């Protein structure tokens, strides 16, 4: 039944419009490339294609080299398996990141929607997701979750997710 496991419609339904539209864009990109799963690297690459976001600002305020990050994400994308003839699906890590972003957004910040900065915090607080993230770029080892949780507004500045 619909009540055996948490549904994607409920889980992803907690995303704000920027994050959810970027899941959609990531799916379209993933499919064009023939990659078998929509992954964190597709989602983060699509978020960084926008004019601005929490992720842009967190990169800036954390002292990450955004050009290096862009290089690393492009290279990770180019290395994914291609020519998938299977039906595309979402990576388990993308589902898990939304759950952890909901936990921190709703409990730590008292907020009804998950913005991309809460996705970053939820990832950093989960060892398997943090390992996946740094696997995409060693730049993400520069993130400091204690700073990001205590000084969130300073890190996200004038992000449109405000």
Residue numbers in the entry: -1 to 160
Sentences from the paper on this structure:
It involves the assembly of a tubular structure composed of TssB and TssC that is similar to the tail sheath of bacteriophages. The AAA+ ATPase ClpV disassembles the contracted sheath, which resets the systems for reassembly of an extended sheath that is ready to fire again. The interaction of TagJ/HsiE with the sheath as well as with ClpV suggests an alternative mode of disassembly in which HsiE recruits the ATPase to the sheath.
The asymmetric unit contains two copies of ClpV1-N in nearly identical conformations (r.m.s. deviation for all Cα atoms of 0.5 Å). The overall structure of ClpV1-N is similar to that of the Vibrio ClpV-N, with matching secondary structure elements and an r.m.s. deviation of 1.6 Å for 121 equivalent Cα atoms. The residues lining the VipB binding groove in ClpV-N are partially conserved in ClpV1-N. For example, Ile10 and Phe87 lie at the bottom of the groove. Both conformations not only diminish the hydrophobic character of the groove but also are incompatible with binding of an α-helix, as observed in V. cholerae. Consistent with the altered conformation of the binding groove, we were unable to obtain a complex of ClpV1-N bound to a peptide corresponding to the N terminus of HsiC1.
